Amino acid sequence: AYQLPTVWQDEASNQGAFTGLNRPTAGARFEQNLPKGEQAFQLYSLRTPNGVKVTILLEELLEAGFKEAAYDLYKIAIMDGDQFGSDFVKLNPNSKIPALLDQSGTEDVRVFESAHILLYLAEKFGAFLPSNPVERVEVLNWLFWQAGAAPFLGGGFGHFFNYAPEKLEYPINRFTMEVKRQLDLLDKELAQKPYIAGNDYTIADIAIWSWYGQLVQGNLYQGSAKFLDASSYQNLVKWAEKIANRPAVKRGLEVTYTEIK
Amino acid sequence: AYQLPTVWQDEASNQGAFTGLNRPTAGARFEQNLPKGEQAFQLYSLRTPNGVKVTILLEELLEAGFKEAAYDLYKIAIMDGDQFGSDFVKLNPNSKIPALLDQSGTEDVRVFESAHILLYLAEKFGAFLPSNPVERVEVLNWLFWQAGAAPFLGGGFGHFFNYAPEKLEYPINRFTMEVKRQLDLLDKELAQKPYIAGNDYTIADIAIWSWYGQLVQGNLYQGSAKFLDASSYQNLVKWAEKIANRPAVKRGLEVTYTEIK
Ligand SMILES: N[C@@H](CCC(=O)N[C@@H](CS)C(=O)NCC(=O)O)C(=O)O
Ligand SMILES: N[C@@H](CCC(=O)N[C@@H](CS)C(=O)NCC(=O)O)C(=O)O
Ligand SMILES: N[C@@H](CCC(=O)N[C@@H](CS)C(=O)NCC(=O)O)C(=O)O
Ligand SMILES: N[C@@H](CCC(=O)N[C@@H](CS)C(=O)NCC(=O)O)C(=O)O
C-alpha cells in the first residue's frame, strides 16, 4: 500500500502521453511570437472536442450568411508544448485551447473557455442562441452544464481509459459510471425534444455534440462506444446523426489549420 | 491485474459515502413535493462550495441595497437522495444543487449550474458584473474557467483524497498535480490584480473563492491545505482572507436553510 505523504511532492509519475506537459505550476515556458492574420477573429486551437465546437459555430454562422464571422485559424500543438509559449499564455493564462483573439474593435479582447467562446460569438451575431429571455436561460443551463460535465468525460474517463499507462479498476469504474449517467441524462432529454434545450439547434447542441455526439458515433476514444454501450442511447445517437449531417458541422470538422512555426 | 471488460457493467463498486446515490442512470427515483415560499427566488441548495456561491451573491446584492433579491432557501440533502425527487428533477434534471426557481415573471424559469445562477442574478440586477463590454468578457473568462476547473478539484482531488475507500497513488498524483497547477495559476493572476479579473470584486471572485479560497483557508477537505502546500500561494491566501472578511460573504456562509420534509 501507498503511504499518503503529509505534504505532496512532485515525484515525476508516468501519466501517459502528457507526462512533462502536465505540471503542478502554471505559466509560459518559452518566448513565442504567434502569427496573426487580418480577419476580426484569430482562433488559436486544435482539432479536438473543444476546438471543433468553435470551428462548427463559426462555420454555422458563415453558412447562415454572416460573412463577418470570417476567421484565421492557427494550430497550437498541445502534444508539443505550444500552449506554454509566452504569446499563447497572453491569450489564455490557463494554457488550453481554444483561445480566441477578437481584434475587431478598438481594443483587442481575449476570449477563452470553449463554452464562453460559443456564447461570445452567439451574442455578437444574434444567432444560435434564442432571443426570447426564457428560452435563452434554458439554453445557458445546458451550455454551462456541458462546461461542468465534460471534465469527467475528458479528464476522468478519457484519461483512465485511453491515456493512463495502466488500466485502473476503481477510477475506470467511477468515471465510467459518471459518463453513463451523463449519456442517460442527455438521452432522456432528447427523448422529449428535437434539440437539447428545445425545438431549435443552438450553441448548447454544438457544445454537447462535440463531446457526447462524437462519443456515441465512435469518433472519440478507441473502444469507448463499445465499452459505454453507446448504441443503447438511441435518442442521443439519432440526434447526433442529424447534427453530423448539417453541412456546417462537416465543414467545422474539416477546416484546416495554419501552422505557427 | 484487472481485465478491462469489453462492455462495462455496473458491478456495485464501493465508492465511499456516495455509493447507492451515484448511479449510471439519471432521473427521479420517488415522488417529491417541494415547498415553495412567496419570494421571487426559490433556491434549492445545500451549504457546499457550489451552494455558497449563490447565497454569497444573494447576500451581496441585499447588502448593496437590492431588496428585490430576497429569497427563500431550502435544503436538499444530497447524502439522503433528495436530489432524486420528482420536483427537484423538474428544476434540474441533472440532480445537483444549486437549483434556482425564479417565479417573479409571468412564467416560472428554472436556472441550474452554479456559475450560470451567478450570471443570471448579476445580469438581472446589474451588479457584480461590469457593464463595460471588454471588462465583462474577462470576468466571464474566469467564471467559465471556474466551471471547467472545479470538477478536477471536487470530482478528482476531493473524491480520491477524502472519499474513496482506499488512497490510490496514481489518481491522487494526477488530480493533486492538477489542483496545484490551478492554485499556481490563480496565485500568479492575483499577484498582478486585486481581484481575479481586474480591479473590482465580481461574480468570478465569488465563484472561485467558494472553492479555491475556502481550500487555502483550510475550510474544504480535512488535511488538504497541508497536503497541497496552501500557504505557499500567498497571493491567493491574501485575496481569500480579504473576501472572507466581507460582511455579505459571512452572511452568505451563515444563512440557514428551510427543511423540505
Ligand atoms: N474548460 C476548457 C477545457 C479546454 C481543454 O481541455 N483544452 C485541451 C484540448 S481539448 C488543451 O488545450 N489541453 C492542453 C493541456 O492540458 O496541456 C474549455 O472548455 O475550453
Ligand atoms: N492536461 C490534460 C491533457 C488532455 C486534455 O487536455 N484533454 C481534454 C480533451 S482534448 C479534456 O479532457 N478537456 C476537459 C474539458 O473539456 O473540460 C490531461 O492530462 O487530462
Ligand atoms: N457544475 C455543477 C456541479 C454542482 C454539484 O456538483 N453539486 C453537488 C453538490 S456541491 C451535488 O448536488 N451533488 C449531488 C450528487 O452528485 O448526487 C454546478 O456548478 O452547479
Ligand atoms: N456524485 C458526486 C457527489 C459529490 C459532489 O457532488 N461533489 C461536489 C462538491 S459538493 C463536486 O465535486 N462538484 C464538482 C463541480 O462543482 O464541478 C461525486 O461522487 O463526486
Coordinates of C-alpha atoms and ligand atoms in Angstrom, one line a residue:
Chain A
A1 CA 0.0 0.0 0.0
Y2 CA 0.9 3.6 -0.5
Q3 CA 1.8 5.9 2.2
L4 CA 0.0 9.2 1.6
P5 CA 2.5 12.0 2.1
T6 CA 1.6 14.8 4.6
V7 CA 2.8 17.4 2.0
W8 CA 2.6 16.4 -1.6
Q9 CA 5.8 16.5 -3.7
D10 CA 6.2 16.1 -7.5
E11 CA 7.9 12.7 -7.8
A12 CA 7.5 12.6 -11.6
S13 CA 4.8 9.8 -12.0
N14 CA 4.3 8.4 -15.6
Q15 CA 0.9 9.9 -16.6
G16 CA 0.9 8.7 -20.2
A17 CA 1.3 10.9 -23.3
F18 CA 1.0 14.2 -21.2
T19 CA 3.9 13.5 -18.8
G20 CA 6.3 16.5 -19.0
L21 CA 3.5 18.8 -20.3
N22 CA 1.3 18.3 -17.1
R23 CA 3.0 20.2 -14.3
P24 CA 2.0 21.4 -10.8
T25 CA 2.8 25.0 -11.9
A26 CA 1.3 27.3 -14.5
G27 CA 2.9 29.8 -16.8
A28 CA 4.8 30.4 -20.0
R29 CA 7.9 28.2 -20.5
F30 CA 9.5 29.9 -23.6
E31 CA 9.2 33.1 -25.7
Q32 CA 6.7 32.6 -28.6
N33 CA 5.6 35.0 -31.3
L34 CA 2.3 33.8 -32.7
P35 CA 1.2 34.7 -36.2
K36 CA -1.8 36.9 -36.7
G37 CA -3.9 37.5 -39.9
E38 CA -6.3 40.3 -41.0
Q39 CA -9.7 38.8 -40.0
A40 CA -11.5 40.0 -36.9
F41 CA -11.2 36.6 -35.3
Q42 CA -7.9 34.9 -34.6
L43 CA -8.5 31.5 -33.3
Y44 CA -5.7 29.5 -31.7
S45 CA -6.9 26.0 -31.4
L46 CA -6.6 22.3 -32.4
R47 CA -9.0 19.7 -33.8
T48 CA -10.2 18.3 -30.5
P49 CA -13.7 18.2 -29.0
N50 CA -13.2 21.6 -27.6
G51 CA -11.7 23.0 -30.7
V52 CA -14.4 21.7 -33.0
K53 CA -17.1 23.5 -31.0
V54 CA -15.8 26.8 -32.1
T55 CA -15.0 25.9 -35.8
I56 CA -18.5 24.4 -36.0
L57 CA -20.1 27.6 -34.7
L58 CA -18.0 29.9 -37.0
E59 CA -18.9 27.6 -40.0
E60 CA -22.6 27.6 -39.0
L61 CA -22.5 31.4 -38.8
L62 CA -20.8 31.7 -42.2
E63 CA -23.4 29.2 -43.6
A64 CA -26.3 31.3 -42.2
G65 CA -24.9 34.3 -44.2
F66 CA -22.9 36.1 -41.5
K67 CA -19.8 36.9 -43.5
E68 CA -18.3 39.0 -40.8
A69 CA -17.6 35.7 -39.0
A70 CA -14.6 35.0 -41.2
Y71 CA -11.7 33.9 -39.1
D72 CA -8.0 33.0 -39.2
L73 CA -7.2 29.6 -37.7
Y74 CA -3.9 28.6 -36.1
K75 CA -2.7 25.2 -34.8
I76 CA -1.5 25.1 -31.2
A77 CA 0.1 21.5 -30.9
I78 CA -0.6 20.7 -27.3
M79 CA 1.4 17.4 -27.6
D80 CA 4.4 19.8 -28.4
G81 CA 4.1 22.3 -25.6
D82 CA 2.8 25.1 -27.9
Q83 CA 0.2 26.1 -25.2
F84 CA 3.2 27.2 -23.0
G85 CA 4.6 29.8 -25.3
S86 CA 4.5 33.4 -24.0
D87 CA 2.1 34.8 -26.7
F88 CA -0.3 31.9 -26.1
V89 CA -0.2 32.5 -22.3
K90 CA -1.2 36.1 -23.0
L91 CA -4.3 34.9 -24.7
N92 CA -5.1 32.2 -22.1
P93 CA -3.1 32.0 -18.9
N94 CA -4.6 28.5 -18.4
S95 CA -2.6 27.2 -21.4
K96 CA -5.5 25.5 -23.0
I97 CA -7.1 25.6 -26.4
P98 CA -9.4 27.1 -27.7
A99 CA -8.4 30.7 -27.3
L100 CA -9.9 33.5 -29.4
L101 CA -8.5 37.0 -30.1
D102 CA -11.1 39.4 -31.4
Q103 CA -9.2 42.3 -32.9
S104 CA -12.3 43.9 -34.5
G105 CA -12.8 46.6 -32.0
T106 CA -10.7 49.4 -30.9
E107 CA -9.1 47.2 -28.3
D108 CA -8.1 43.5 -28.6
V109 CA -10.3 41.2 -26.5
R110 CA -9.1 37.7 -25.4
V111 CA -11.9 35.1 -25.1
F112 CA -11.1 31.6 -23.6
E113 CA -13.1 28.6 -22.4
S114 CA -14.8 26.9 -25.3
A115 CA -18.3 27.4 -23.9
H116 CA -17.6 31.1 -23.3
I117 CA -16.4 31.4 -26.9
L118 CA -19.7 29.9 -28.1
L119 CA -21.6 32.4 -26.0
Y120 CA -19.5 35.4 -27.0
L121 CA -19.9 34.6 -30.8
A122 CA -23.6 33.8 -30.5
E123 CA -24.3 37.1 -28.6
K124 CA -22.2 39.1 -31.0
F125 CA -24.1 37.9 -34.0
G126 CA -27.5 37.1 -32.5
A127 CA -27.7 33.7 -33.9
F128 CA -27.7 30.1 -32.4
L129 CA -28.9 31.5 -29.1
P130 CA -32.6 32.4 -28.7
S131 CA -33.5 36.0 -28.2
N132 CA -36.5 35.0 -26.0
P133 CA -35.2 35.5 -22.4
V134 CA -36.9 32.4 -21.1
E135 CA -35.7 30.1 -23.9
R136 CA -32.3 31.7 -23.5
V137 CA -32.0 30.7 -19.8
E138 CA -32.7 27.1 -20.7
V139 CA -30.0 27.1 -23.5
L140 CA -27.5 28.5 -21.0
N141 CA -28.4 25.9 -18.5
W142 CA -27.2 23.2 -20.9
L143 CA -24.2 25.2 -22.0
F144 CA -23.0 25.6 -18.5
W145 CA -23.9 22.0 -17.9
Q146 CA -21.6 20.8 -20.7
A147 CA -18.8 23.0 -19.2
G148 CA -19.2 21.3 -15.8
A149 CA -19.7 17.8 -17.1
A150 CA -17.1 17.4 -19.8
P151 CA -14.2 17.2 -17.3
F152 CA -15.5 13.9 -16.0
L153 CA -15.6 12.6 -19.7
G154 CA -12.3 14.0 -20.8
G155 CA -10.2 14.4 -17.6
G156 CA -11.7 11.3 -15.9
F157 CA -13.0 8.7 -18.2
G158 CA -10.8 9.6 -21.2
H159 CA -7.6 9.8 -19.2
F160 CA -8.1 6.5 -17.3
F161 CA -9.5 4.6 -20.3
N162 CA -7.2 5.8 -23.0
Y163 CA -4.1 7.5 -21.6
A164 CA -3.0 6.2 -18.3
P165 CA -0.2 3.7 -18.5
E166 CA -2.2 1.1 -16.6
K167 CA -5.9 0.3 -16.6
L168 CA -7.0 1.1 -13.0
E169 CA -10.2 -0.6 -11.9
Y170 CA -11.6 1.8 -9.3
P171 CA -11.1 5.1 -11.3
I172 CA -12.4 3.5 -14.5
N173 CA -15.5 2.4 -12.6
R174 CA -16.0 5.8 -11.1
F175 CA -15.7 7.8 -14.3
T176 CA -17.5 5.2 -16.4
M177 CA -20.4 5.2 -14.1
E178 CA -20.5 9.0 -14.3
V179 CA -20.2 9.3 -18.1
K180 CA -23.0 6.7 -18.4
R181 CA -25.2 8.8 -16.1
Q182 CA -24.4 11.9 -18.3
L183 CA -25.3 9.9 -21.5
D184 CA -28.6 8.6 -19.9
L185 CA -29.5 12.2 -18.9
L186 CA -28.9 13.5 -22.4
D187 CA -30.7 10.6 -23.9
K188 CA -33.8 11.2 -21.6
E189 CA -33.9 14.9 -22.6
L190 CA -33.6 14.1 -26.3
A191 CA -36.5 11.6 -25.9
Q192 CA -38.7 14.7 -25.3
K193 CA -37.2 17.4 -27.5
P194 CA -35.6 17.5 -31.0
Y195 CA -32.6 19.5 -29.6
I196 CA -31.1 19.6 -26.2
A197 CA -32.8 22.8 -25.0
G198 CA -36.0 22.7 -27.1
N199 CA -37.1 23.0 -30.6
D200 CA -34.1 24.7 -32.2
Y201 CA -30.4 24.0 -32.8
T202 CA -28.3 26.2 -30.5
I203 CA -24.9 26.6 -29.1
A204 CA -25.9 24.1 -26.4
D205 CA -26.2 21.4 -29.1
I206 CA -22.9 22.4 -30.6
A207 CA -21.1 22.3 -27.2
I208 CA -22.6 18.9 -26.2
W209 CA -22.4 17.3 -29.7
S210 CA -18.7 18.0 -29.9
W211 CA -18.2 15.6 -26.9
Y212 CA -21.2 13.3 -26.4
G213 CA -22.3 13.2 -30.0
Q214 CA -18.9 12.3 -31.3
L215 CA -18.6 9.8 -28.5
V216 CA -21.7 7.8 -29.4
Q217 CA -20.7 7.9 -33.1
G218 CA -17.4 6.2 -32.2
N219 CA -15.2 9.3 -33.0
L220 CA -13.7 9.8 -29.6
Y221 CA -11.6 7.3 -27.7
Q222 CA -10.9 4.0 -29.5
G223 CA -13.2 1.3 -28.0
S224 CA -15.2 3.7 -25.9
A225 CA -18.5 3.4 -27.8
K226 CA -18.5 -0.3 -27.3
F227 CA -17.4 0.0 -23.7
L228 CA -20.0 2.5 -22.8
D229 CA -22.9 0.7 -24.7
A230 CA -23.3 3.8 -26.8
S231 CA -25.8 2.3 -29.2
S232 CA -28.2 1.9 -26.2
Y233 CA -28.8 5.7 -26.0
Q234 CA -30.8 5.7 -29.2
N235 CA -32.2 9.3 -28.8
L236 CA -28.7 10.6 -28.4
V237 CA -27.5 8.6 -31.4
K238 CA -30.2 9.9 -33.6
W239 CA -29.7 13.5 -32.6
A240 CA -26.0 13.0 -33.2
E241 CA -26.5 11.6 -36.7
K242 CA -28.8 14.6 -37.5
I243 CA -26.3 17.1 -36.4
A244 CA -23.4 15.3 -38.1
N245 CA -25.2 15.7 -41.4
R246 CA -25.5 19.5 -41.1
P247 CA -23.3 21.0 -43.9
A248 CA -21.6 23.4 -41.5
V249 CA -20.8 20.7 -38.9
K250 CA -19.0 18.8 -41.7
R251 CA -17.1 22.0 -42.6
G252 CA -16.4 22.8 -39.0
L253 CA -14.8 19.3 -38.6
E254 CA -12.8 19.6 -42.0
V255 CA -11.5 23.1 -41.8
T256 CA -7.7 23.1 -42.0
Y257 CA -5.3 24.9 -39.7
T258 CA -2.4 27.3 -40.3
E259 CA 0.9 26.3 -38.6
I260 CA 2.5 28.7 -36.1
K261 CA 6.1 27.9 -36.8
Chain B
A1 CA -4.3 -7.1 -12.7
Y2 CA -7.7 -6.2 -13.8
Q3 CA -9.3 -7.4 -17.0
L4 CA -10.9 -4.4 -18.6
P5 CA -14.4 -5.6 -19.8
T6 CA -15.3 -5.1 -23.5
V7 CA -18.7 -3.6 -22.4
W8 CA -18.9 -2.1 -18.9
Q9 CA -21.4 -3.5 -16.4
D10 CA -22.4 -2.0 -13.0
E11 CA -20.8 -4.4 -10.5
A12 CA -21.6 -2.2 -7.5
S13 CA -18.1 -1.0 -6.5
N14 CA -17.7 0.7 -3.1
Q15 CA -17.2 4.4 -4.0
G16 CA -17.3 5.8 -0.4
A17 CA -20.1 7.9 1.1
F18 CA -21.9 8.3 -2.3
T19 CA -22.3 4.6 -3.1
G20 CA -26.0 4.0 -3.9
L21 CA -26.6 7.7 -4.8
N22 CA -24.1 7.5 -7.7
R23 CA -25.7 5.6 -10.5
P24 CA -25.1 5.0 -14.2
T25 CA -28.6 6.3 -15.0
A26 CA -30.3 9.6 -14.4
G27 CA -33.8 10.5 -13.4
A28 CA -36.2 10.9 -10.5
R29 CA -36.4 7.9 -8.1
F30 CA -39.6 8.9 -6.0
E31 CA -42.4 11.5 -6.0
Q32 CA -41.5 14.6 -4.1
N33 CA -43.5 17.8 -3.5
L34 CA -41.1 20.6 -2.7
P35 CA -42.2 23.6 -0.6
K36 CA -42.3 27.0 -2.2
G37 CA -42.4 30.4 -0.5
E38 CA -43.6 33.9 -1.7
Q39 CA -40.2 35.4 -2.7
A40 CA -39.3 35.8 -6.3
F41 CA -36.3 33.4 -5.8
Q42 CA -36.7 29.8 -4.5
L43 CA -33.3 28.4 -4.0
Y44 CA -33.0 24.6 -3.6
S45 CA -29.4 24.0 -2.4
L46 CA -27.0 22.9 0.4
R47 CA -24.2 24.5 2.2
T48 CA -21.4 23.3 -0.1
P49 CA -18.8 25.1 -2.3
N50 CA -21.4 25.3 -5.0
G51 CA -24.2 26.3 -2.8
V52 CA -22.4 29.1 -1.0
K53 CA -21.7 30.8 -4.3
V54 CA -25.3 31.6 -4.7
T55 CA -26.1 32.6 -1.0
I56 CA -22.9 34.8 -1.1
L57 CA -24.2 36.6 -4.2
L58 CA -27.7 37.0 -3.0
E59 CA -26.4 38.4 0.4
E60 CA -24.0 40.7 -1.5
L61 CA -26.9 42.0 -3.5
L62 CA -29.0 42.5 -0.4
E63 CA -26.1 44.3 1.2
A64 CA -25.7 46.6 -1.8
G65 CA -29.3 47.7 -1.3
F66 CA -31.1 45.4 -3.8
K67 CA -34.0 44.3 -1.7
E68 CA -35.7 42.6 -4.6
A69 CA -33.0 39.9 -4.2
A70 CA -34.9 38.4 -1.2
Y71 CA -35.0 34.7 -1.5
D72 CA -36.5 31.5 0.1
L73 CA -33.8 28.9 0.8
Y74 CA -34.5 25.1 1.1
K75 CA -32.2 22.2 2.0
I76 CA -31.8 19.4 -0.5
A77 CA -29.8 16.7 1.5
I78 CA -27.8 15.1 -1.2
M79 CA -26.5 12.4 1.3
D80 CA -30.2 11.5 1.6
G81 CA -31.2 11.2 -2.0
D82 CA -33.3 14.5 -2.0
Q83 CA -31.8 15.4 -5.4
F84 CA -33.7 12.4 -7.0
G85 CA -37.2 13.6 -6.0
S86 CA -39.5 14.3 -8.9
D87 CA -40.0 18.0 -8.1
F88 CA -36.2 18.5 -7.8
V89 CA -35.7 16.7 -11.1
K90 CA -38.1 19.2 -12.7
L91 CA -35.9 22.0 -11.6
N92 CA -32.6 20.3 -12.5
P93 CA -32.7 17.1 -14.5
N94 CA -29.0 16.6 -13.6
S95 CA -30.0 16.1 -9.9
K96 CA -27.4 18.5 -8.5
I97 CA -27.6 21.5 -6.3
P98 CA -27.9 24.5 -6.6
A99 CA -31.1 24.9 -8.5
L100 CA -33.0 28.2 -8.7
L101 CA -36.7 28.8 -9.5
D102 CA -37.4 32.4 -10.4
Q103 CA -41.2 32.8 -10.1
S104 CA -41.1 36.6 -10.5
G105 CA -42.2 36.8 -14.0
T106 CA -45.3 35.6 -15.7
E107 CA -43.7 32.2 -16.3
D108 CA -41.5 30.2 -13.9
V109 CA -37.9 29.9 -15.0
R110 CA -35.6 27.1 -13.8
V111 CA -31.9 28.1 -13.6
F112 CA -29.2 25.5 -12.8
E113 CA -25.4 25.3 -12.8
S114 CA -24.0 27.4 -10.0
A115 CA -21.9 29.6 -12.4
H116 CA -25.0 30.2 -14.5
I117 CA -27.0 31.2 -11.5
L118 CA -24.3 33.7 -10.7
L119 CA -24.6 35.1 -14.2
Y120 CA -28.3 35.1 -14.3
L121 CA -28.6 37.1 -11.0
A122 CA -25.8 39.5 -11.8
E123 CA -27.4 40.3 -15.2
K124 CA -30.8 40.6 -13.7
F125 CA -29.6 43.2 -11.2
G126 CA -26.7 44.8 -13.0
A127 CA -24.3 44.3 -10.2
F128 CA -21.1 42.3 -9.5
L129 CA -20.6 42.0 -13.3
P130 CA -19.1 45.0 -15.1
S131 CA -21.2 46.8 -17.6
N132 CA -18.1 47.7 -19.8
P133 CA -18.2 45.0 -22.6
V134 CA -14.4 44.4 -22.5
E135 CA -14.2 44.1 -18.7
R136 CA -17.2 41.8 -18.9
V137 CA -15.6 39.4 -21.3
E138 CA -12.6 39.0 -19.0
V139 CA -15.0 38.3 -16.0
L140 CA -16.8 35.7 -18.0
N141 CA -13.5 34.1 -18.9
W142 CA -12.8 33.4 -15.3
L143 CA -16.3 32.4 -14.5
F144 CA -16.4 29.8 -17.2
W145 CA -12.9 28.8 -16.2
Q146 CA -14.1 28.0 -12.7
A147 CA -16.9 25.9 -14.1
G148 CA -14.5 23.9 -16.1
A149 CA -11.8 23.6 -13.5
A150 CA -13.7 22.7 -10.3
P151 CA -14.5 19.2 -11.4
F152 CA -10.9 18.3 -11.1
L153 CA -10.8 19.7 -7.6
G154 CA -14.1 18.3 -6.4
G155 CA -14.7 15.2 -8.6
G156 CA -11.0 14.3 -8.8
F157 CA -8.9 15.5 -6.0
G158 CA -11.7 15.7 -3.4
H159 CA -13.1 12.3 -4.3
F160 CA -9.7 10.4 -4.2
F161 CA -8.2 12.3 -1.2
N162 CA -11.3 12.4 1.0
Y163 CA -14.0 9.9 -0.1
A164 CA -12.6 6.9 -1.8
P165 CA -12.3 3.9 0.5
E166 CA -8.6 3.4 -0.3
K167 CA -5.9 6.1 -1.0
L168 CA -4.9 5.4 -4.6
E169 CA -1.4 6.6 -5.6
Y170 CA -1.8 7.3 -9.3
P171 CA -5.2 9.1 -9.3
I172 CA -4.1 11.2 -6.2
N173 CA -1.0 12.2 -8.0
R174 CA -2.9 13.1 -11.2
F175 CA -5.5 15.3 -9.5
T176 CA -3.1 16.8 -6.9
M177 CA -0.8 17.9 -9.7
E178 CA -3.8 19.5 -11.5
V179 CA -5.2 21.2 -8.4
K180 CA -1.7 22.6 -7.7
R181 CA -1.4 24.0 -11.2
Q182 CA -4.9 25.6 -10.8
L183 CA -3.7 27.2 -7.4
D184 CA -0.4 28.4 -9.1
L185 CA -2.4 30.0 -11.9
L186 CA -4.8 31.8 -9.6
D187 CA -1.9 32.9 -7.4
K188 CA 0.0 34.3 -10.4
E189 CA -3.1 36.3 -11.5
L190 CA -3.7 37.6 -8.1
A191 CA 0.0 38.7 -7.9
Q192 CA -1.0 41.3 -10.6
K193 CA -4.5 42.3 -9.8
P194 CA -6.5 42.9 -6.6
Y195 CA -9.4 40.6 -7.8
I196 CA -9.4 37.7 -10.3
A197 CA -10.5 39.6 -13.3
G198 CA -9.2 43.1 -12.5
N199 CA -9.8 45.9 -10.1
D200 CA -13.3 45.0 -8.8
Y201 CA -14.9 42.2 -6.9
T202 CA -17.2 40.3 -9.3
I203 CA -19.1 37.0 -9.7
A204 CA -15.8 35.5 -10.9
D205 CA -14.3 36.1 -7.4
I206 CA -17.4 34.6 -5.7
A207 CA -17.3 31.5 -7.9
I208 CA -13.6 30.9 -7.4
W209 CA -13.5 31.9 -3.8
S210 CA -16.2 29.4 -2.8
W211 CA -13.8 26.6 -4.0
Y212 CA -10.2 27.8 -4.1
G213 CA -10.4 30.5 -1.4
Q214 CA -12.0 28.1 1.1
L215 CA -9.5 25.5 0.2
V216 CA -6.5 27.6 1.0
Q217 CA -8.2 28.8 4.3
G218 CA -8.4 25.1 5.4
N219 CA -12.3 25.0 5.1
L220 CA -12.6 22.3 2.4
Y221 CA -11.3 18.7 2.8
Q222 CA -9.6 17.9 6.1
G223 CA -5.8 17.8 5.7
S224 CA -5.9 19.3 2.1
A225 CA -4.4 22.7 2.9
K226 CA -1.4 21.0 4.4
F227 CA -1.2 18.4 1.6
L228 CA -1.4 21.0 -1.1
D229 CA 1.1 23.4 0.5
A230 CA -1.7 26.0 0.5
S231 CA 0.2 28.6 2.5
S232 CA 2.7 28.7 -0.4
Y233 CA 0.1 30.6 -2.6
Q234 CA 0.3 33.7 -0.6
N235 CA -1.4 36.0 -3.2
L236 CA -4.4 33.6 -3.2
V237 CA -4.3 33.4 0.6
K238 CA -4.4 37.2 1.0
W239 CA -7.2 37.6 -1.5
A240 CA -9.1 34.8 0.2
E241 CA -8.7 36.5 3.6
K242 CA -10.0 39.8 2.2
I243 CA -13.1 38.2 0.7
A244 CA -13.7 36.2 3.8
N245 CA -14.0 39.4 5.7
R246 CA -16.7 41.0 3.5
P247 CA -19.9 41.2 5.7
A248 CA -22.1 39.6 3.0
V249 CA -19.7 36.6 2.5
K250 CA -20.0 35.9 6.2
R251 CA -23.8 36.1 5.9
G252 CA -23.8 34.0 2.7
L253 CA -21.9 31.3 4.7
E254 CA -24.2 31.6 7.8
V255 CA -27.6 31.8 6.3
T256 CA -29.8 28.9 7.5
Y257 CA -31.8 26.6 5.4
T258 CA -35.5 25.6 5.5
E259 CA -36.2 21.8 5.5
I260 CA -38.2 20.2 2.7
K261 CA -39.9 17.5 4.8
Ligands
LIG1 N1 -12.7 24.0 -19.9 C1 -11.8 24.2 -21.1 C2 -11.0 22.9 -21.3 C3 -10.2 23.1 -22.6 C4 -9.2 21.9 -22.8 O1 -9.3 20.9 -22.1 N2 -8.3 22.0 -23.8 C5 -7.4 21.0 -24.1 C6 -7.5 20.5 -25.5 S1 -9.2 19.8 -25.8 C7 -5.9 21.5 -24.0 O2 -5.7 22.5 -24.5 N3 -5.0 20.8 -23.3 C8 -3.7 21.2 -23.1 C9 -3.1 20.8 -21.8 O3 -3.8 20.3 -20.8 O4 -1.8 21.0 -21.7 C10 -12.6 24.6 -22.3 O5 -13.7 24.1 -22.5 O6 -12.1 25.3 -23.2
LIG2 N1 -3.7 18.1 -19.3 C1 -4.8 17.3 -19.9 C2 -4.4 17.0 -21.3 C3 -5.5 16.3 -22.1 C4 -6.7 17.3 -22.4 O1 -6.5 18.5 -22.4 N2 -7.9 16.7 -22.6 C5 -9.1 17.5 -23.0 C6 -9.8 17.0 -24.2 S1 -8.6 17.3 -25.6 C7 -10.1 17.5 -21.9 O2 -10.2 16.4 -21.3 N3 -10.8 18.6 -21.6 C8 -11.7 18.6 -20.4 C9 -12.8 19.6 -20.6 O3 -13.1 19.9 -21.8 O4 -13.4 20.1 -19.6 C10 -5.0 16.0 -19.1 O5 -4.0 15.4 -18.7 O6 -6.1 15.5 -19.0
LIG3 N1 -21.3 22.0 -12.3 C1 -22.3 22.0 -11.2 C2 -21.8 21.0 -10.2 C3 -22.8 21.1 -9.0 C4 -22.5 19.9 -7.9 O1 -21.5 19.2 -8.0 N2 -23.4 19.8 -6.9 C5 -23.2 18.8 -5.9 C6 -23.1 19.5 -4.5 S1 -21.8 20.7 -4.4 C7 -24.4 17.9 -5.8 O2 -25.5 18.3 -5.8 N3 -24.2 16.5 -5.7 C8 -25.2 15.5 -5.8 C9 -24.8 14.2 -6.4 O3 -23.8 14.2 -7.2 O4 -25.7 13.3 -6.2 C10 -22.5 23.3 -10.7 O5 -21.6 24.1 -10.6 O6 -23.6 23.7 -10.2
LIG4 N1 -21.7 12.5 -7.2 C1 -20.6 13.3 -6.6 C2 -21.0 13.6 -5.2 C3 -20.1 14.6 -4.6 C4 -20.3 16.0 -5.2 O1 -21.3 16.3 -5.7 N2 -19.2 16.9 -5.1 C5 -19.2 18.3 -5.5 C6 -18.8 19.2 -4.4 S1 -20.1 19.2 -3.1 C7 -18.3 18.4 -6.7 O2 -17.3 17.8 -6.7 N3 -18.7 19.2 -7.7 C8 -17.8 19.4 -8.9 C9 -18.1 20.7 -9.6 O3 -18.5 21.6 -8.9 O4 -17.8 20.9 -10.8 C10 -19.3 12.5 -6.7 O5 -19.3 11.3 -6.4 O6 -18.2 13.2 -6.9

